[PDB]
């Protein structure tokens, strides 16, 4: 009953099971630990970062090793459009003979790989199960390096100080230039040297790379300035990927669009992209001042940025010390940027597939988009939660105020009511009218008169598609016109490739849109606005409100303030995160439902099914869920089973976890404490069991813990059931 | 010993033995005193 929460003496003195539960959930909140200083905080965070990167590299190495050992990578190379990639083998003693037979792939039961790693590794120039093994070996070596570094930087003479940790200019210069630019430069080097010849049949391994010229002229044009030579003779339109037939000699080109065979971006396009990004980031990494008297001091930049007329208060004067001294502000900024970035990855890796033969891998396309959108929602909610935490525990009004006037951040708490009221107005506006149009379509179609539907053509979005060259909406605007200056400017660089790809019905590049797209985009906007409303309200109201003008004194996460003053359930800022998680899950569900139904109709060919039935709710319920759930639920029946049996089991498992979350959310404490007391009496008053007694007094889960557990069940069930549905439906419908 | 015997050697090992020893260690640690 002691010594487990070593970091908290208050918990270690708890005589109940709450100590164990809270010991888990407070282990990473280093700022709240006993005998805590800032130096130890930054050092522990640094070591934890090292361990985390080691974990990531070990996970990647495991994926590589299991593809190399139990996969069919080599067979998939020779026939990427017919051979289904294998993730890893299965050894489960609970299998019957039927399950073994159904999951049997080649030599052993195995799982199909939906991560798209086969296409990614094939694109970057891997052709052998020994190339994957080398990658796994190297990644385990890198993990060992990172673990050694993490141990080393906790040693006495190697523990960095607060000044080093808060040295913003040095870290920015190095991160930008070194990390981004130099990693892009090295990736361009690999892309060219290995990937470009490997796509043309020439093997460039760790033996013949110092003697195989990536370009026939060989670094002469680069130093000579004749950089056009690297773009001459690109890959033809009859080039077979991985073979020298119809190949070229160029290494950096503009082509635009996709490879005619793999239906993916040109490797020479991506090498040029990464070279340009490398140059730009290396240049941008010299901005801030270091030991050589030139550069920028960001404190001065922030302080000097006050509009002269005066509408942002005193400007950004106090922001430097605010951000530097708070790890939650930086964490929130990083999480918001990462969420936007992974939303970008999801939205671009389906419209512009970058890996060979990934466009025809429909289950992996759906899985990748869903995975990245869910990660995006999680990251955004985390960014807002950490902003709220910064408000609660790191924000100092004195730093952000100069002689009564407030800086740009402190002024966000002055018109907080205006911000929240207008977020509420936008949410109500969008919800009222999107639901009104959807229900109008529902009722009108149900009454057998679909012509009375309200169908709004998304002209604004179709205008953008025409601006990028789509000649489908008869707009003749910028790139849909051959005479506009936008078209004449790039008529010789990348329009022929771009136009040939955007004006193609088999791509996902700028999918044609209609009224259903309009309505679902408005639903998405409503979801985004409502999630933002909840999170922003929790962040701004974190330090106090009218119901609790001292909420900052109770911390970020506390159960309530009691039944007084009318009742104060879910009044903390943590509860705002807890409520906004449901809205994030709902919004990501809407986004992924829209994407998956649109792409299922596109792949099956019945795009008229979406364009007609997507305007009313029953259309969704009947033609997406009810229609495509048939292959999934018949993964095992009283007659047999298929390789989709695991997905049906996961479907039911997700439903069960969802409803257990419903348990933990609807039923609150107090009802579970008295029942536990009855159980305690029963155990204490029964023979043959009195010999065994608990060391920690069994008590019901706390209010905040119960909310967390219900949210965890809700989210896990949500994710599992939707993953099972999307994967099984795609597999069982599209062969 | 072939490579295909490794799943049958490791999956029971990990998925049953590692839980047992991990539970023993974690229970002992969280039930300690001072």
């Amino acid at each position: 009953v002691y010594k487990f929460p070593k970091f908290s003496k208050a918990l270690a003195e708890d005589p109940s099971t709450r100590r164990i539960w809270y010991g888990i959930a407070t282990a990473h909140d280093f700022e709240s630990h006993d005998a805590m200083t800032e130096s130890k905080l930054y050092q522990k965070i640094f070591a934890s970062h090292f361990g985390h990167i080691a974990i990531i590299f070990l996970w990647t190495a495991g994926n590589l090793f299991h593809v190399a050992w139990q996969g069919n990578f080599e067979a998939w190379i020779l026939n990427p459009l017919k051979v289904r990639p294998i993730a890893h083998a299965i050894w489960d003693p609970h299998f019957g003979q039927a399950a073994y037979k159904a999951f049997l792939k080649t030599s052993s039961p195995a799982n199909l790989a939906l991560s798209g790693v086969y296409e990614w590794w094939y694109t970057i120039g891997m052709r052998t199960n020994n190339d994957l093994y080398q990658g796994s070996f190297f990644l385990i070596l890198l993990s060992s390096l990172l673990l050694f570094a993490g141990w080393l930087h906790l040693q006495p003479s190697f523990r960095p100080s607060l000044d080093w940790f808060k040295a913003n200019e040095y870290r920015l210069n190095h991160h930008l230039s070194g990390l981004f630019g130099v990693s892009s430069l090295a990736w361009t080097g690999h892309l060219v040297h290995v990937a470009i010849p490997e796509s043309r049949g020439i093997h460039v391994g760790w033996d013949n790379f110092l003697t195989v010229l990536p370009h026939p002229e060989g670094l002469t044009p680069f130093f000579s300035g004749n950089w056009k030579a690297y773009a001459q003779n690109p890959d033809t339109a009859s080039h077979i990927f991985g073979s020298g037939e119809g190949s070229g000699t160029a290494i950096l080109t503009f082509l635009g669009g996709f490879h005619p065979q793999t239906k993916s971006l040109w490797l020479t396009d991506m090498a040029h992209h990464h070279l340009a990004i490398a140059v730009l980031f290396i240049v941008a990494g010299h901005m801030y001042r270091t030991n050589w008297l030139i550069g920028h001091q960001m404190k001065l930049i922030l302080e000097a940025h006050r509009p002269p007329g005066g509408r942002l208060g005193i400007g950004h004067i106090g922001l430097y010390e605010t951000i530097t001294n708070s790890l939650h502000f930086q964490l929130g900024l990083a999480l918001a940027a990462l969420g936007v970035a992974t939303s970008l990855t999801a939205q671009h890796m389906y419209a512009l597939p970058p890996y060979a033969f990934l466009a025809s891998n429909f289950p992996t396309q759906a899985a990748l988009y869903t995975h990245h959108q869910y990660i995006a929602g999680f990251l955004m909610v985390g960014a807002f939660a950490h902003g709220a935490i910064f408000f609660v525990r790191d924000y100092d009004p004195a730093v952000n105020t100069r002689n009564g006037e407030k800086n740009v951040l402190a002024r966000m708490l002055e018109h907080k009511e205006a911000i929240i009221s207008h977020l509420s107005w936008v949410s109500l506006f969008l919800g009222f009218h999107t639901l009104g149009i959807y229900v109008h379509n529902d009722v009108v179609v149900a009454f057998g008169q679909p012509e009375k539907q309200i169908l709004v053509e998304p002209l604004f979005a179709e205008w953008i598609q025409a601006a990028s060259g789509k000649t489908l909406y008869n707009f003749d605007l910028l790139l849909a016109s051959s005479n506009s200056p936008a078209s004449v400017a790039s008529s010789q660089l990348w329009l022929p490739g771009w136009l040939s790809a955007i004006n193609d019905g088999k791509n996902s590049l700028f999918l044609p849109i209609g009224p259903g797209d309009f309505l679902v985009h408005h639903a998405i906007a409503l979801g985004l606005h409502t999630t933002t409303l909840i999170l922003v309200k929790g962040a701004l109201d974190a330090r106090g409100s009218k119901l609790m003008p001292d909420k900052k004194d109770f911390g970020y996460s506390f159960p309530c303030d009691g039944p007084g003053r009318g009742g104060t359930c879910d009044i903390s800022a943590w509860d705002a995160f807890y409520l906004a998680m449901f809205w994030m899950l709902n919004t990501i569900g809407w986004v992924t439902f829209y994407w998956h139904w649109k792409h299922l109709t596109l792949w099956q060919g019945n795009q008229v099914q979406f364009n007609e039935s997507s305007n009313y709710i029953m259309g969704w319920l009947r033609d997406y869920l009810w229609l495509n759930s048939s292959p999934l639920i018949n993964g095992y029946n009283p007659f047999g089973m298929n390789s989709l049996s695991v997905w049906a089991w996961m479907f039911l498992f997700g439903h069960l976890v969802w409803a257990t979350g419903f348990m933990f959310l609807i039923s609150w404490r107090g009802y579970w404490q008295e029942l536990i007391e009855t159980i305690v009496w029963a155990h204490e008053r029964t023979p043959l069991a009195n010999l065994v007694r608990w060391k920690d007094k069994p008590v019901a889960l706390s209010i905040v813990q119960a909310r967390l557990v219900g949210l965890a069940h809700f989210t896990i069930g949500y994710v599992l059931t939707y993953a099972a549905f999307v994967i099984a439906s795609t597999i069982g419908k599209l062969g | 010993m072939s490579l295909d015997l490794l799943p049958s050697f490791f999956v029971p090992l990990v998925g049953l033995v590692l839980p047992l020893f991990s539970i023993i260690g974690l229970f002992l640690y969280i039930e300690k005193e001072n």
Binding site: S48, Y133, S144, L154 | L3
Partner: peptide, 30 residues
């Protein structure tokens, strides 16, 4: 198909990475 030697040495290297992990884990304290 990878050999027994390839898998064996990868397992041995994985063990070394495990001993480095507990050293980091124990150094991050109880």
């Amino acid at each position: 198909m990878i050999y027994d030697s390839q898998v064996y040495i990868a397992l041995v290297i994985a063990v070394v990475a495990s001993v480095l992990a507990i050293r980091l884990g124990a150094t991050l304290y109880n």
